[PDB]
Amino acid sequence: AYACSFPPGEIPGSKECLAEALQKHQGFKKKSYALICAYLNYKEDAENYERAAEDFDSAVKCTGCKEGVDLHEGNPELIEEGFEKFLASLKIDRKALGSLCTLFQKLYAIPHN
Amino acid sequence: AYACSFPPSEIPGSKECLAEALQKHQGFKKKSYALICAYLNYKEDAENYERAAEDFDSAVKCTGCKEGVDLHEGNPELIEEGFEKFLASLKIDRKALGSLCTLFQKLYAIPH
Ligand SMILES: [Zn+2]
């Protein structure tokens, strides 16, 4: 699930659409970094990844970006491919994934209001 | 801050009190693993660490454990020793830091 916390992109056709949504909209960043953390523990908890992927799928629909990101989150043979697609599409530094997961804590502070 | 979400320990005098609270209570895992994530990023955001440490301190009060874990969270020269005290007290292997931080996401589900 993801209730849209931000409006549609003004650059839906841009190769930067998803990367810019990530930067500008904390809620999309939270779901994206949550997904990275879930990926890193996929082999011990596939259901958590599946839920995080569904949440991300929900949040991506908010963006209006044209670029499709099929995570194939229920298909073990395609999990890696789908996650790499996500990284490519969002223009994430793929050598920094550990760090980005660790930032989920900063982006989703507790307690909060 | 931390709004106590679990009951205080049955073994407040024990050297195992904090490790036992961590084992039993998700809320204490949440604040502990959040602290770990904040520590891993200390060198780029000390304020976030200070806040997470204060939150952890508050969660420690909720446990009722007598043992102290002084994180020295405002003192750069002592952050390392404070965090090592945290690891020793909660019986967390330093090799496990990355994994435990990554688990904050699983233990703090969004949306909610
Ligand atoms: Zn929350």
Descriptive notes:
The complex is a heterodimer of chains A (113) and B (112). With 113 residues, chain A is mostly helical. Chain A has one domain: Up-down Bundle (Four Helix Bundle (Hemerythrin (Met), subunit A)). Helices cover 55% and strands 0% of the residues of chain A. Chain A is built from six helices and no strands. Chain A has helices spanning 17-24, 26-40, 46-63, 79-89, 97-102, 104-107. Chain A is globular, with a radius of gyration of 13 Å. Chain A starts with 16 loop residues before the first helix and ends in a 6-residue tail after the last helix. By secondary structure, chain B is mainly α. Chain B has a single domain (1-112), classed as Four Helix Bundle (Hemerythrin (Met), subunit A) (Up-down Bundle). Chain B is 57% helix and 0% strand. In chain B, helix 1 (17-24) packs across helix 2, helix 2 packs antiparallel against helix 3 and helix 2 crosses helix 5 (97-107). Chains A and B meet through helix 2, helix 3, helix 5 and helix 6 of A and helix 2, helix 3 and helix 5 of B. The complex binds zinc ion.
Question: Mind sketching the topology for me?
Answer:
The complex is a heterodimer of chains A (113) and B (112).
Chain A: H1 17-24, H2 26-40, H3 46-63, H4 79-89, H5 97-102, H6 104-107
Helix pairs in contact in A: 1-2, 2-3
Chain B: H1 17-24, H2 26-40, H3 46-63, H4 79-90, H5 97-107
Modified residues (2',4',5'-topaquinone) (chain B): 2, 108
Cross-link (Lysine tyrosylquinone (Lys-Tyr)) (chain B): 30-108
Subunit structure (chain B): Homodimer. The two chains, designated A and B, differ in their modifications, but not, it is thought, in their sequence.
Helix count, DSSP H or I runs of 4 or more residues of chain A: 6
Give the SSE string of chain B. Answer: HHHHH
Rg over C-alpha atoms of chain B, rounded to the nearest angstrom: 13 Å
Shape of chain B: globular
Order of helices and strands of chain A: HHHHHH
The assigned structural class of chain B equals mainly alpha
Number of discrete domains of chain B: 1
CA radius of gyration of chain A: 13 Å
Number of distinct beta strands of chain A? 0
CATH topology-level fold name of chain A: Four Helix Bundle (Hemerythrin (Met), subunit A)
Give the cofactors and ligands: zinc ion
* CATH class category name of chain B: Mainly Alpha
Largest interface: A-B, 27 and 27 residues
Tell me the distance between the termini of chain A: 20 Å
* Shape, per Cα inertia axes of chain A: globular
What is the CATH class designation of chain A? Mainly Alpha
Quantity of strands of chain B, as a count: 0
Percent range of helical residues of chain A: 40-55%
Largest sheet of chain B: none
Structural class by sheet pairing and helices of chain A:
mainly alpha
